[PDB]
Symmetry: C3
Subunit: 32 residues, 3 copies
């Protein structure tokens, strides 16, 4: 199971990575 769990953690890390970039884009677009 542990390798799969490491898989799942990495899938979450990747989703977070992309979300962080999208948030940054929104932050810039709402900024003055």
């Amino acid at each position: 199971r542990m390798k799969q769990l490491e898989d799942k953690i990495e899938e979450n890390t990747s989703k977070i990575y992309h979300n962080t970039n999208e948030i940054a884009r929104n932050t810039k677009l709402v900024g003055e």
Copy 2:
């Protein structure tokens, strides 16, 4: 411990799911 760790991973997956939707809403609202 492993079942609890799977729990925690799922709690993070769920938080990511909701954040992704909220980010999408912000993206649309900042869009032209």
Copy 3:
């Protein structure tokens, strides 16, 4: 390995925590 995996999960939890706050800021700034 399990302690390290718990580490990694917590690093993701922390990234999510900060992203949630930033999303909230963007939500308020796009709000009427």
